[PDB]
Amino acid sequence: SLSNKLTLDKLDVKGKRVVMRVDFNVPMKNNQITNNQRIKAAVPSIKFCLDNGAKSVVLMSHLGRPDGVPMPDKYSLEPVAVELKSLLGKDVLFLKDCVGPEVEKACANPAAGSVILLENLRFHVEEEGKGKDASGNKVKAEPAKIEAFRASLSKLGDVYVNDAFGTAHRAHSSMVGVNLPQKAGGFLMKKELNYFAKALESPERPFLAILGGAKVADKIQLINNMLDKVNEMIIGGGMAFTFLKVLNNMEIGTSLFDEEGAKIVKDLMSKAEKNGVKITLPVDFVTADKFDENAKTGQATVASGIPAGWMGLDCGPESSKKYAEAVTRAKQIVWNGPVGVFEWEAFARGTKALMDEVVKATSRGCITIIGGGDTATCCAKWNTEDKVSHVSTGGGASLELLEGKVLPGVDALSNI
Numbered sequence: 001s002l003s004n005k006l007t008l009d010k011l012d013v014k015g016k017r018v019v020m021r022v023d024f025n026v027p028m029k030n031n032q033i034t035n036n037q038r039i040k041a042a043v044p045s046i047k048f049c050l051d052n053g054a055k056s057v058v059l060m061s062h063l064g065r066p067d068g069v070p071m072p073d074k075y076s077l078e079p080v081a082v083e084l085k086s087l088l089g090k091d092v093l094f095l096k097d098c099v100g101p102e103v104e105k106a107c108a109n110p111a112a113g114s115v116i117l118l119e120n121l122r123f124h125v126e127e128e129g130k131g132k133d134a135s136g137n138k139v140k141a142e143p144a145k146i147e148a149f150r151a152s153l154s155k156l157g158d159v160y161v162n163d164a165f166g167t168a169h170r171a172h173s174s175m176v177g178v179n180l181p182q183k184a185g186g187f188l189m190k191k192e193l194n195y196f197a198k199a200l201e202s203p204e205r206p207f208l209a210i211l212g213g214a215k216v217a218d219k220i221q222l223i224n225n226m227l228d229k230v231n232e233m234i235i236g237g238g239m240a241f242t243f244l245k246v247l248n249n250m251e252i253g254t255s256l257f258d259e260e261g262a263k264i265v266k267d268l269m270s271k272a273e274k275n276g277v278k279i280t281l282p283v284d285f286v287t288a289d290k291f292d293e294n295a296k297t298g299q300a301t302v303a304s305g306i307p308a309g310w311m312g313l314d315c316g317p318e319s320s321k322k323y324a325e326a327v328t329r330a331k332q333i334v335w336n337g338p339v340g341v342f343e344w345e346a347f348a349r350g351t352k353a354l355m356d357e358v359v360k361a362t363s364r365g366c367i368t369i370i371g372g373g374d375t376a377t378c379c380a381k382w383n384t385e386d387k388v389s390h391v392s393t394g395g396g397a398s399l400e401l402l403e404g405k406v407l408p409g410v411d412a413l414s415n416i
């Protein structure tokens with residue numbers, strides 16, 4: 001994917017300020033970083049810039065989904081600056097904004113070797129181009145303000161590097177809108193794209209996709225194209241309830257539900273049938289009376305339904321058996337999205353059981369690819385990072401590659 005693009009190995013950085021988009025959207029629990037994978041993954045590009053004489057490296061990322069409102073109490077990148085220091089062996093200056101005159105002054109003429117991390121890009125609606133105000137009402141960014149936002153970011157370096165593989169599916173301002181003469185892909189971008197190019201060229205079959213998690217509105221829209229590439233699909237985690245409500249008339253309580261995706265569920269199942277893709281949905285659940293680690297818990301099946309005011313936060317044991325059967329048939333697996341709220345032990349058994357099966361599959365020759373901010377944290381939590389074929393920093397980004405697309409963050413790089 002980058003044979004035609006400028007990459008960092010061929011970018012002259014000596015004496016240049018480098019502005020670098022990274023994916024530092026790391027998971028957090030009790031206000032601390034629970035997995036530094038995405039930060040560590042950018043260190044090779046950052047160190048390369050410094051070792052080869054860069055005047056500065058300005059790092060920019062989002063964290064979470066603050067929807068264009070400053071939320072430094074909940075989604076500040078300040079903790080990431082602290083963690084990056086230990087991983088880099090070098091000092092990092094944190095700025096409390098990402099644009100404006102104070103940021104521009106701090107980045108205009110830095111001391112040699114300076115590393116600077118900006119605040120969450122998504123505190124400004126101009127990054128995504130849309131969001132919500134502080135009262136929760138949806139809002140769209142104004143074109144002239146988007147261009148001024150992109151112009152401000154562009155002043156923070158002389159050359160641009162994009163190492164944000166995990167965000168490469170997003171055509172956001174920091175990812176496609178920086179206007180500098182040289183825009184290069186970083187070493188993590190290259191590593192991930194190269195791995196997927198080889199693994200997706202002629203997959204081992206049956207090729208199973210496992211789609212879970214909580215980003216239902218976004219990821220239900222990826223299934224249509226994925227159904228032209230895979231032979232089996234597990235639809236689990238928060239994704240399943242939209243399917244079960246529509247197909248089975250199941251009562252789902254307060255479980256995650258996507259109104260727009262519900263309108264295409266039957267068409268997706270029809271396409272799966274046309275293409276010979278076996279769909280495995282859960283059949284039982286661990287329920288909770290509220291979205292809380294210490295919620296009261298219960299059990300439910302598709303036939304029983306989930307009680308009003310309760311939500312399904314994990315699959316149950318009969319679902320785990322069906323998931324295991326699909327893993328045993330697979331010769332290649334791509335997995336994005338845990339099949340329950342694995343961060344909370346009451347709701348982690350289903351994801352742990354599936355991880356055990358995927359590890360066993362790897363040991364008998366299955367090619368196993370696990371990707372995503374939270375899904376890769378499953379590998380860290382249960383110590384399986386070296387027991388699957390590849391742990392990717394991309395989740396949705398990897399699914400969009402599976403669909404067969406050129407990612408916007410790659411398309412926007414300079415051509416050779």
Ligand SMILES: Nc1ncnc2c1ncn2[C@@H]1O[C@H](COP(=O)(O)OP(=O)(O)OP(=O)(O)O)[C@@H](O)[C@H]1O
Pocket residue numbers: 166212213214215236237238239256312313314336337338339340341342343371372373374375376393394395396397
């Ligand atoms: N039934 C469920 N209800 C609610 N949340 C769920 C459920 N099952 C899983 N989750 C949540 O899904 C979240 C992860 O979903 P998400 O799509 O963000 O995955 P990801 O691997 O981080 O992907 P990406 O890299 O694209 O962000 C986890 O925090 C987990 O708690």
Ligand SMILES: O=C(OP(=O)(O)O)[C@H](O)COP(=O)(O)O
Pocket residue numbers: 023025064065166167170215371372373374393394395396397
């Ligand atoms: O976490 C990401 O994607 P992912 O959840 O699929 O791994 C990226 O940081 C992009 O975040 P977004 O899905 O809020 O745009």
Ligand SMILES: [Cl-]
Pocket residue numbers: 214215216217218219
């Ligand atoms: Cl979403």
Ligand code: NA
Pocket residue numbers: 373374
């Ligand atoms: Na996530």
